[PDB]
Write a protein that binds this ligand. Structure first.
Ligand SMILES: CCC1=C(C)/C(=C/C2=NC(=C\c3[nH]c(/C=C4\NC(=O)[C@H](C)[C@H]4CC)c(C)c3CCC(=O)O)/C(CCC(=O)O)=C2C)NC1=O
Ligand SMILES: CCC1=C(C)/C(=C/C2=NC(=C\c3[nH]c(/C=C4\NC(=O)[C@H](C)[C@H]4CC)c(C)c3CCC(=O)O)/C(CCC(=O)O)=C2C)NC1=O
Ligand SMILES: CCC1=C(C)/C(=C/C2=NC(=C\c3[nH]c(/C=C4\NC(=O)[C@H](C)[C@H]4CC)c(C)c3CCC(=O)O)/C(CCC(=O)O)=C2C)NC1=O
Ligand SMILES: CCC1=C(C)/C(=C/C2=NC(=C\c3[nH]c(/C=C4\NC(=O)[C@H](C)[C@H]4CC)c(C)c3CCC(=O)O)/C(CCC(=O)O)=C2C)NC1=O
Ligand SMILES: CCC1=C(C)/C(=C/C2=NC(=C\c3[nH]c(/C=C4\NC(=O)[C@H](C)[C@H]4CC)c(C)c3CCC(=O)O)/C(CCC(=O)O)=C2C)NC1=O
Ligand SMILES: CCC1=C(C)/C(=C/C2=NC(=C\c3[nH]c(/C=C4\NC(=O)[C@H](C)[C@H]4CC)c(C)c3CCC(=O)O)/C(CCC(=O)O)=C2C)NC1=O
Ligand SMILES: CCC1=C(C)/C(=C/C2=NC(=C\c3[nH]c(/C=C4\NC(=O)[C@H](C)[C@H]4CC)c(C)c3CCC(=O)O)/C(CCC(=O)O)=C2C)NC1=O
Ligand SMILES: CCC1=C(C)/C(=C/C2=NC(=C\c3[nH]c(/C=C4\NC(=O)[C@H](C)[C@H]4CC)c(C)c3CCC(=O)O)/C(CCC(=O)O)=C2C)NC1=O
Ligand SMILES: CCC1=C(C)/C(=C/C2=NC(=C\c3[nH]c(/C=C4\NC(=O)[C@H](C)[C@H]4CC)c(C)c3CCC(=O)O)/C(CCC(=O)O)=C2C)NC1=O
Ligand SMILES: CCC1=C(C)/C(=C/C2=NC(=C\c3[nH]c(/C=C4\NC(=O)[C@H](C)[C@H]4CC)c(C)c3CCC(=O)O)/C(CCC(=O)O)=C2C)NC1=O
Ligand SMILES: CCC1=C(C)/C(=C/C2=NC(=C\c3[nH]c(/C=C4\NC(=O)[C@H](C)[C@H]4CC)c(C)c3CCC(=O)O)/C(CCC(=O)O)=C2C)NC1=O
Lengths: 225, 162, 172, 162, 172, 162, 172, 162, 162
């Protein structure tokens, strides 16, 4: 069928080479092949959850993918695919956002980079409505950038967020993009005002005692004999 | 958001296919459900106030250490029992919403997704709400088909809590 | 992401000569007070859960809307997510007083948080009141002495008040 | 699997670089820890049997409805109290393992990862083990630095349970 | 991925009672010799590059095929990849003597390495000779004492010979 | 950015947990390091000017074709030798920063990440800085604990260059 | 991403009739001068490294801050990254004169580059001076004739000055 | 967008390297192509109007049910035949663009990507445009280099349609 | 593996399409290249032995500290000069292979991918092979197309080394 629009790429910290070195701003990398103990599976599963769902609660966790991955038949790439097509991601991210903001969020969380331009999210928003969320996630995983940067056996991360000798590099994309936007919090109607200022009690205004007032000596008379 | 209609739309939507005959059946099968379901929601709305009061009675009679031992979580004083009336009223209202929508999605969205951390951090033993929902499912006195729907309904509530 | 040791390093590098003697007296007394600093952090994270529930319980006693229907923290996952956010802010302010610098705090969590809470519809002043009450309990937990040698932690009481204040003012 | 040495190895493996100067300090800082830690593990091994018996005493005195009300979870009969001795002995032994390893990884691997579903499905209120660990941390009587390390230790246990 | 502390932990857990006193004497003397252990690791990784080039230079002096055309390490990226592999084996044996256990070595790098070198067509005995010569130089960086306190390192020179030997025999 | 404290924070952030006994162990092990490290940084600051002059002397005596052959990279004229004083002063200052921070992260961030392309494109043979760092590590004369850090320290510099 | 052949194609398609005769004289003389064009590109990329180091060496002679401490290109990886950027700009201007159109240049590298250099803190005028000096050397290697029969190169000396100028003005 | 030059640029960009010797070779091979290709584009521009009229004649003579049967797709009345002149003129113009660019990219971009759904939904049998392109490739009378390239050219058109 | 034919096959495979017109032009443009390229490969095979001997002469005359200073990398004794004859013979043979294949792929695969680590770890300054390839470029004596092709060729070698 109809191919994608050709959108020109824009400059970013990713398409550039970069001379990376081992520091902490580099995300700890979680790979299926070397975790081989039972606890390190828990750390990897927690990290993939932190990326895809932002701290999934026990309701959001899928027993089948975690079980099957601890046995080792599942690849972590297939595990991320199963997370994206799972209903808690669809419910939290595909439902509440429009197609364009969903593609923005999904590119950030699968590929680990911001989309290059608005026309890229526009060009990728054809395929999700025409061919389904499964085909969108499948075509996203099959692209060569996800494969060269992470591969089969690596949980993705935000790639080259922070440059050397910077205080800040970049917003971590978990802070930057939450699941609501302004448009759907308007539907939920959340800014109901806290209204705890200027209540205007009607009781009579207190007047400071004038010089020579009897009360002025009340507080010392209470302390005296 | 689990109603049969939105899941039909999500299936057609995920697939990308147009609405079909398979989706259509759900709508007139939602007739087998809804023709009693709206009646049962109304009669639960009538039964509601005595249901929460009896459920509070059953929870206090099952666990006397709640009404005895002083604590923030326990209903020793008045305000704890007010929190209990609030919590069981929330549970009964989510049962009514779950009954009107046709699926567990309102109940699964408004109650179930955070109940594990709330029961962990705030020291609310879920067997209390087990007692409350079991007393409700014994006391509601639904008739025929509507009653059967609630059991599947209220058992899902207990299974999410347990 | 900056330790105060590498704060002195990066400032002396942007200057471009060696670290002066006055900064070395300061760093030596940093080394003599970092003992207080590091495990001040851990006694703050000792009762971190009870601190979080007490601050949230006070907040929802002060503002009854947030547990009223229609409020921001009303439904169950939104209330759990609010507890998650308060735990995260406490944990990052704990990281910041472990590094000894507010750079991790302003760098890791605070910066986009203002825009996130505005775009979600989340009230910011409620968070500000929560982090302020949480900070009061935080120093006092660390400040009070149970099974610990008496010592001058005044700087710790000082710097952790600064860190909680930067958190609350950057939430806004 | 959280010990400081395996985390240094994991950091060096994830970065793909051999251990630096900073990595070396880690182990001679494990000297500040271990020079009391092995002593404290031995004295906990000596204190162990009276610790579990006193913790069972404190849990039964805090919650009399456990020893009163008949149930599978509650310790009404002998075999329930035997399960309690098993559970608190497991908790104390994981504290000893956590003390010897140097990090929370044995305790986090052997206890913490499944405790939420076990407390949910088997009706074990975690405030019972809160009482047990608080009684242990009051009763162990550790000296100096060893006592403080355990306290951060046992507070992590309560924070995982609460 | 196993520290010797959690080796004792996992063995006592599979037993299922507390750690005995004899294992605690052993672990205390482990703590008294781990000083030697950890920075034995870092002085091994002090001259790790010169160790790698000296072992490879000796290997290609001993086997002139591997720099002859048609050999396995002949072209430039294959020679660079062979240097990469020897650096990786040295780094993992360094990790293994830092953990104090050969579990990281047999767990992280050695296991599929035998099948990888067979399926690539890479000679295994050449790697075995390389890791053996590399281990000799490795202890002696450690084994010879210059400008430092004398010590009973015989036990330890010991363990790194065991680790290099397991590496070379598992390559085969 | 490799100091032991920021790596402890990075580990706790990647795992999502709070600190443990290990953080305390890490920093009081940074006492085993820092109690000599700040002394050694001060005495290197005192030794600094004669160190760069002797290192320039050793590099010129090892490689006479630098002072002989006319070129932009070679120090034939004055301005080349001024560039040499700048380069070795940068190396010594990064050693001092690396010593004060406690880890290789300042040195690994300010020197190591681009040195391969700079030595490739600008024709700076790294064996020159090998000579310079070997002369520094022979000439600095730090007794005891300080010497071990430097060898561990300055050997990492040579291993990054070679 | 546009060749000048498909520039004529896309313009005639947006018009919607066949390619006129005047555009065909122009395209025929494009074909007669594209010989000059393509290998003008490759002689520009002949000395591309020495061009890059000479332009950077001139730039850091003109602005001594960028190798002074506190400057933008001071530390070693930042200096290497600046060399990488100058090589990238030269390579893309080389692609642009190979396509014969500045569309690859404005499309592939220049557009977000302005915002990138502003958001990084990188000076833009220094880059502008660098690309201008680099372009002067570029034609004089393209422009000067060595081992090539002398022939008119006005379009080539001309068009590559236009491409370097668009690069420097779009950096700003 | 398939011309040999943009594919050389795309290869060099995907490989992230400066244009090589092979890229230079390609454009002087675009001389073997273009030295006849621009001539053939001009002579097709001259031949164009009689080509579309003869192709319409051949399509109407091959399929008389188009000119007979009344329908929206069929050219029964005048406006259908006007649509036919438009469609075959579009095909011939894309052949001319494809000839001038040097590759199939203009033709593959402007015609081929949507032709399957248009022929499916609008009831345009592609064997009609098969007849049209076969009549064009028989009637154009191109010679030498232009003739061989066009057949490779027009056969690609039929292979995309069939 | 960069020849123009395999890159045409790789482009057609990645697009999952049949060979385009540009690829066909590609090979008759490989005629503009190959009709001199095979001649130049033969005359380089004839010139080869005096080329390596003159390049060794030029490298020894440019850098006398190689023939003077004793070392493993330096050609002080006989076996070092034998290694030099091997290295420059390898460079000239890769130039001949690169000339016969038509693209840089043999040279880029057999030399360029590991040259940075080999020059880093084994202390081989690449300016030596810069001298060697510049001396080779100066005296080959090829005339016309081959000479121009070689310059693009040997300059790519120097650009990979520098
Ligand atoms: C969709 C179908 C499906 C099944 C059935 C399945 C089973 C399954 N059971 C597992 C473990 C397990 N299975 C058991 C089983 C039992 N305990 C006992 O003592 C009894 C013999 C038995 C209870 C019947 C135990 C104890 C483990 C944990 C072993 C471990 O994780 O170390 C694991 C390893 C992952 C983990 O849970 O840690 C998988 C994948 N996975 C699947 O995807
Ligand atoms: C709509 C779905 C929904 C659920 C499930 C829910 C549970 C819930 N119950 C709460 C409190 C409570 N719930 C109870 C009720 C009980 N505790 C006991 O010990 C009794 C046995 C039981 C009475 C049946 C009590 C006593 C509190 C008070 C906690 C406090 O004051 O700190 C709180 C803390 C909010 C507050 O401070 O008012 C939440 C979020 N809230 C919701 O909005
Ligand atoms: C590392 C730093 C970091 C922070 C701080 C952060 C905050 C953050 N808070 C959120 C939600 C939230 N935040 C709150 C906040 C509160 N409830 C109230 O009523 C008070 C006004 C306030 C408590 C202080 C609530 C209720 C939500 C849930 C809104 C929703 O998810 O619909 C969300 C949306 C995702 C979700 O949890 O559902 C993010 C990303 N994320 C980060 O990565
Ligand atoms: C190594 C870490 C570890 C933990 C944490 C653990 C908890 C644990 N406690 C259990 C049972 C139990 N634990 C208790 C203990 C108590 N319940 C009470 O009501 C008392 C207040 C409290 C005494 C302190 C009791 C009574 C059971 C019995 C459940 C039954 O018989 O169905 C069971 C069911 C296994 C069985 O049937 O024997 C598990 C898995 N098991 C472990 O292996
Ligand atoms: C990470 C930075 C660091 C290093 C490098 C370090 C090394 C170090 N090695 C020490 C001891 C020692 N180190 C050795 C080592 C050896 N003796 C031999 O004859 C053998 C050949 C060789 C082992 C192969 C010995 C024998 C001692 C004696 C004291 C002790 O047991 O620690 C000590 C004891 C305290 C002191 O010397 O002041 C230090 C400091 N400490 C540090 O904080
Ligand atoms: C990671 C495991 C670990 C811990 C927990 C630890 C704590 C620790 N705190 C100490 C001291 C101390 N800690 C405090 C702390 C305080 N005093 C107050 O009155 C304040 C309220 C409070 C701070 C808010 C003080 C005052 C000292 C005095 C000694 C010193 O300056 O270190 C010391 C000095 C050595 C010793 O006590 O034997 C230790 C060991 N050391 C460790 O290795
Ligand atoms: C902070 C870490 C850091 C490092 C490592 C560094 C290396 C570095 N050395 C340079 C130049 C230089 N460095 C040297 C030094 C030497 N060359 C020789 O032949 C001598 C043997 C050796 C003296 C020891 C010389 C002569 C140049 C001049 C290059 C030129 O003028 O083109 C330049 C070019 C910058 C300029 O033009 O001033 C860099 C970036 N710069 C840094 O900022
Ligand atoms: C395809 C087109 C494209 C361009 C142009 C591009 C530029 C680009 N230049 C960068 C940095 C840089 N750019 C410079 C620039 C210079 N140094 C100076 O002093 C001068 C003002 C200027 C030289 C002209 C420097 C020093 C850095 C490093 C800043 C840093 O990484 O901290 C970075 C950050 C990543 C990094 O290299 O660390 C990008 C993405 N990326 C692209 O994808
Ligand atoms: C891709 C590999 C490749 C290259 C590099 C190549 C170049 C090349 N340039 C040529 C001609 C030429 N090239 C130039 C170029 C110039 N003269 C000037 O004075 C100007 C300054 C400059 C342009 C800026 C000229 C003037 C000719 C004359 C012959 C012609 O028109 O082609 C020719 C004609 C045939 C021949 O020389 O044998 C070749 C081969 N051919 C190839 O196959
Ligand atoms: C640039 C590439 C391009 C192609 C391939 C193209 C095909 C194309 N042909 C169309 C119509 C048509 N094309 C034809 C032509 C024919 N049908 C027959 O039955 C005859 C045998 C044949 C004459 C050769 C007819 C009759 C229609 C009319 C459909 C209608 O009026 O509903 C339409 C509908 C647009 C309209 O309503 O005018 C499209 C999109 N359009 C393009 O822009
Ligand atoms: C096919 C592509 C290819 C390249 C590029 C290559 C480089 C290469 N040159 C080497 C050695 C060498 N190459 C040289 C040559 C020189 N050194 C100098 O100082 C002189 C200036 C220069 C003479 C021009 C020398 C002296 C060695 C010896 C290193 C040693 O014996 O340790 C080695 C070490 C292999 C061995 O020990 O024989 C490699 C891999 N090998 C290859 O197979």
């Amino acid at each position: 069928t109809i191919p994608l629009l050709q959108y020109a790429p824009s400059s970013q910290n990713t398409r550039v080479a970069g001379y990376t070195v081992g520091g902490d701003e580099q995300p700890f990398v979680f790979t299926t092949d070397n975790v081989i103990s039972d606890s390190d599976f828990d750390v990897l599963i927690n990290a993939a959850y932190r990326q895809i769902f932002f701290h999934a609660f026990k309701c959001d966790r899928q027993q089948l993918l975690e079980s099957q991955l601890r046995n080792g038949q599942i690849t972590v790439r297939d595990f991320i695919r199963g997370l994206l097509l799972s209903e808690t991601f669809i419910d939290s991210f595909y439902n509440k956002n429009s197609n364009y903001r969903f593609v923005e969020q999904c590119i950030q969380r699968v590929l680990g980079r911001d989309p290059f331009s608005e026309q890229e999210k526009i060009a990728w928003s054809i395929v999700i409505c025409t061919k389904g969320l499964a085909a969108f996630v499948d075509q996203l995983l099959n692209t060569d950038e996800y494969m060269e940067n992470f591969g089969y056996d690596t949980v993705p991360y935000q790639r080259r967020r922070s440059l050397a000798s910077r205080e800040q590099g970049e917003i971590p994309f978990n802070i930057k993009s939450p699941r609501y936007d302004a448009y759907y919090r308007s539907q939920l109607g959340f800014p109901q005002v806290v209204w705890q200022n200027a209540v205007r009690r009607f009781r009579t205004p207190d007047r400071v005692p004038q010089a020579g007032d009897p009360a002025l000596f009340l507080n010392m008379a209470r302390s005296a004999q | 958001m689990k109603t049969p209609l939105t899941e039909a739309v999500a299936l057609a939507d995920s697939q990308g296919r147009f609405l079909s005959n398979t989706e259509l059946q759900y709508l007139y099968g939602r007739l087998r459900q809804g023709a009693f379901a709206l009646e049962a929601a109304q009669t639960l709305t009538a039964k509601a106030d005595t249901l929460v009061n009896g459920a509070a009675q059953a929870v206090y009679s099952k666990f006397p250490y709640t009404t005895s031992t002083p604590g923030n979580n326990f209903a020793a004083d008045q305000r704890g029992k007010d929190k209990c009336a609030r919590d069981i009223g929330y549970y009964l209202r989510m049962v009514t919403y779950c009954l009107v929508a046709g699926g567990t999605g309102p109940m699964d969205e408004y109650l179930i997704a955070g109940v594990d951390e709330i029961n962990r951090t705030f020291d609310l033993s879920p067997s209390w709400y087990v007692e409350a929902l079991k007393h409700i499912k014994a006391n509601h006195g639904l008739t025929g088909d509507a009653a059967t729907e609630t059991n599947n309904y209220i058992d899902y509530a207990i299974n999410a809590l347990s | 992401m900056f330790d105060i040791f590498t704060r002195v390093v990066s400032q002396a590098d942007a200057r471009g000569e060696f670290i002066s003697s006055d900064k070395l007296e300061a760093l030596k007394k940093v080394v003599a007070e970092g003992t207080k600093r590091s495990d001040a952090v851990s006694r703050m994270t000792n009762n971190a859960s009870s601190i979080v529930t007490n601050a949230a319980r006070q907040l929802f006693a002060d503002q009854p809307q947030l547990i009223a229907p229609g409020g921001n923290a009303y439904t169950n996952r939104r209330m759990a997510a609010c507890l998650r956010d308060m735990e995260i802010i406490l944990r990052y302010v704990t990281y910041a007083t472990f590094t000894g610098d507010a750079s991790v705090l302003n760098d890791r969590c605070l910066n986009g948080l203002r825009e996130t809470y505005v775009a979600l519809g989340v009230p910011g002043a409620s968070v500000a009141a929560g982090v302020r009450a949480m900070g009061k309990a935080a120093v006092a937990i660390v400040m009070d002495p149970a099974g610990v040698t008496s010592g001058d932690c005044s700087s710790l009481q000082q710097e952790i008040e600064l860190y909680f204040e930067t958190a609350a003012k950057a939430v806004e």
